[PDB]
Structure 1
Amino acid sequence: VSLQDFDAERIGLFHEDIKRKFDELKSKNLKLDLTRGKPSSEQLDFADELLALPGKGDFKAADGTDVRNYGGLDGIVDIRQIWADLLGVPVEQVLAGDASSLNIMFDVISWSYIFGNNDSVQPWSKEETVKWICPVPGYDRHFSITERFGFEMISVPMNEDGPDMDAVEELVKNPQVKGMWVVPVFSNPTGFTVTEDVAKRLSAMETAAPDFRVVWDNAYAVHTLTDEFPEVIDIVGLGEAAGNPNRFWAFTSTSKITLAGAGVSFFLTSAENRKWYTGHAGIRGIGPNKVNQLAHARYFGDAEGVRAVMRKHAASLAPKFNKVLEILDSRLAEYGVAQWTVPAGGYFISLDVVPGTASRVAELAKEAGIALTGAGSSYPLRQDPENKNLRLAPSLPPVEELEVAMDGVATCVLLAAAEHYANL
């Protein structure tokens, strides 16, 4: 019997039962935080050597470029080739920037708004209405960019194999629709991964806008919890093969590989998109930081060197995800109140509680000294229409803290569920 099928008296009693546990949880006086989707100090220690790279006397890229001096908008060949080899794409596709791929995403959107993109009839700022496809649950920092530009964000379900392509293929037939966000591998926060079939559908679909763009933000391209690395779909190539070469603006970075905020970002896109981008970037400045790019190239040496680092991250993160999953199972399984993802990579676990209770869960956790990301945080304008989803971030705390914190979260899920069904 799930809680929802408890009779009126049984759920009342269950409510009194679980409230005793909640009282015990509060008497612990916890101060714990499950909100931070960032690497732990242990993981940042792996790149300690990078703090001393590229090192005295070592300032030449593989083509002879003095990385210390001005110029070059594309990034240095050394780091571009490593990433091309890692991702299995032609090097010509790859541009290497500064330390933030979000910065580049914002820029390409803002330039499409101001100037138009290379396929635009006119700039997006001339449109009465710009709409933007948002697979949910998704990444708050993506949705914040589109919200700040005033675009009407239209949600679609993020499914196990990627965004619901029936819904997307329909929505893009509206010319107001100028693009879409997706995190295609270990998606933030669902852990779901776009299949080859879904990528093909995104690549071949017809859009009403001539200048429609998919942001393919492959932020977790190599970020496995296991020994297996996920497939890297050459999405820019798929767009080229389908006859929509300019469709995909693809990104990734080293922020959860080396240093979070001081890594190197990459922008992968078609020939025509890259000329558009560097023509605007060349007015914004002289070009990106080549020294940090050479530092990175030296640290990794080659693509296998990147995978070797990712195995260290996996070994550090795996027990943390395991603890969270173990606790959710032991406390909640029997009750039919919640569903959670079981990801094989990325930085998050996505938890769905009783619809109408996610805000209450986060409130109860807060009264108990446990910080959860708020209800709706993974949705545009922070509006989850079912008030059910919560994001869990296991990476930073030690396992002992995760155990305590999740045990408390589970109690909160149960109490909120008991309140909800008792009030019905």
Structure 2
Amino acid sequence: SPQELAALHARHQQDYAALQGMKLALDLTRGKPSAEQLDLSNQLLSLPGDDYRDPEGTDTRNYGGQHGLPGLRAIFAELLGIAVPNLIAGNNSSLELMHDIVAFSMLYGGVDSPRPWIQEQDGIKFLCPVPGYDRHFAITETMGIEMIPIPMLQDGPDVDLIEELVAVDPAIKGMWTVPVFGNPSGVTYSWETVRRLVQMRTAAPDFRLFWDNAYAVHTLTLDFPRQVDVLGLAAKAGNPNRPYVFASTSKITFAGGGVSFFGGSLGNIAWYLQYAGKKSIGPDKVNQLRHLRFFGDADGVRLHMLRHQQILAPKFALVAEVLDQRLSESKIASWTEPKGGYFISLDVLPGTARRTVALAKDVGIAVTEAGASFPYRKDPDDKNIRIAPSFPSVPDLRNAVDGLATCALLAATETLLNQ
């Protein structure tokens, strides 16, 4: 009934009134480790110690070495399934590696580009599976690269749709991906999805897969995902230069104090370093030795990620319990229960996402902007909301999610009622 809707809306008004009265100051936008997680690697603050030399004898305190410490690259070679000469180590930002590679592609073109992308006078286009990473889209938006949203399925993106786009459009030069524990879909690419993406024919000869494996070992269970050899499949398929692989220890060690990694064919490595050499003499070797001494080996990082999991998994479980209690009866919402990564993706009643965050903002609860997971912040259904549960304490988290549920219910009946 329209009248029983009006009755429920009133109950939601009192709950919002009561929630507003609690005058809170919570935040669900911070995709950063908690202080408890960062304590796990406090040994780094005293590393490397007096021994400033890596196992090869190189003085990490002095200029030199573009590829990075081989000992550290060997640890993540195993974790990612990439050969050491196909993997380099940079500074504190993997996003900076992605941005530089896009900027190099526009200014100088890829290793096999017909011309720099800026010289294509009609334009450049990237494919962006949604919901996706906002900072992925900020790179292409700032660089004038147009972005084409792609639906996300269970085992990866819509490969049928991608294969038709890249076949007809030479302007499509790349695609943003998070192939493991997607931000924020939580979706991990299947072996078949990987196989077809590196095999599909592209109108652009220099099409690139931006393989941001940012959560490669960031499990929320006791199981670690088997990495698909995207570089090996691409080489066997005749497209060795297609994948650009990225990873980072920002959510393994310190967020912003870790090490970044880039992986690709030997030509792509040489191509990137030729232009990165005009920018920097080389990366920070001392921090790379800090992580080498701290980790020890690849089995060490795996154990380190299980201590992160012990801190993180109860928080993801709490968000699922609160949303299930407040919202399952309403049948207005759906949300992921991810096996890894740092984000839960919540879908509320269409046309209420922007309203839900506005209502939450004015009771002291900061929520990720509606549409952040989409290029140009354009969620066509006005329903998606990203939830970042890693940082706040369990009690702060319990109240933020419970408050967010109250606003989502109020915004729901408000939309059904007045329209």
Give the TM bin, normalised by the shorter chain: over 0.9
SS of equivalent residue, structure 2 residue 247: strand
2:112 equivalent among 91, 100, 119: 119
Q: Where do 5+ consecutive residues of structure 1 fail to align?
A: 1-6
1:370 aligns with 2:365: yes
SS of equivalent residue, structure 1 residue 172: helix
Map of 1:140-151 to 2, 5 A cutoff? 140-151=134-145
AA in 1 matched with 2:62: N
Q: Distance in 2 between matches of 1:210 and 1:368?
A: 52
2:11 alignment counterpart: 17
Q: Distance in 1 between matches of 2:278 and 2:329?
A: 60
Q: Distance in 1 between matches of 2:139 and 2:402?
A: 35
AA in 2 matched with 1:85: E
1:207 equivalent among 194, 202, 221: 202
Q: Is the 8 A contact 2:316 2:389 kept in 1?
A: yes
Q: Distance in 2 between matches of 1:143 and 1:391?
A: 15
Give the % identical residues. Answer: 55
Q: Where do 5+ consecutive residues of structure 2 fail to align?
A: none
1:421 alignment counterpart: 416
1:89 equivalent among 75, 82, 92: 82
2:403 alignment counterpart: 408
2:176 alignment counterpart: 181
1:110 aligns with 2:132: no
1:360 aligns with 2:355: yes
AA in 2 matched with 1:94: L
2:159 alignment counterpart: 165
Q: Distance in 1 between matches of 2:187 and 2:145?
A: 25
2:40 equivalent among 29, 42, 46: 46
Pairwise CA distance, 1:147 = 0.2
1:300 aligns with 2:276: no
SS of equivalent residue, structure 2 residue 376: helix
SS of equivalent residue, structure 1 residue 188: coil
SS of equivalent residue, structure 1 residue 421: helix
1:344 alignment counterpart: 339
Map of 1:241-256 to 2, 5 A cutoff? 241-256=236-251
SS of equivalent residue, structure 2 residue 361: helix
1:286 aligns with 2:281: yes
SS of equivalent residue, structure 1 residue 249: strand
Number of aligned residues: 417
Map of 1:260-275 to 2, 5 A cutoff? 260-275=255-270
AA in 2 matched with 1:130: I
Q: Distance in 1 between matches of 2:313 and 2:334?
A: 20
1:63 alignment counterpart: 56
1:77 alignment counterpart: 70
AA in 1 matched with 2:232: G
Q: Distance in 1 between matches of 2:368 and 2:43?
A: 33
AA in 2 matched with 1:223: H
Q: Distance in 2 between matches of 1:356 and 1:165?
A: 28
1:233 equivalent among 217, 228, 231: 228
Q: Distance in 1 between matches of 2:263 and 2:155?
A: 22
Pairwise CA distance, 1:86 = 1.9
Q: Distance in 1 between matches of 2:245 and 2:287?
A: 21
SS of equivalent residue, structure 2 residue 129: strand
SS of equivalent residue, structure 2 residue 32: coil
Q: Distance in 2 between matches of 1:417 and 1:201?
A: 40
Map of 1:382-397 to 2, 5 A cutoff? 382-397=377-392
1:129 aligns with 2:123: yes
Deviations 1:311-345 (A, max 9, x none): 11000011111111100001111111000000011
1:313 alignment counterpart: 308
SS of equivalent residue, structure 1 residue 95: strand
AA in 2 matched with 1:132: F
Q: Distance in 2 between matches of 1:87 and 1:210?
A: 26
Pairwise CA distance, 1:90 = 1.7
AA in 2 matched with 1:50: L
2:376 alignment counterpart: 381
What is the CA RMSD across the aligned residues, in angstroms? 0.9
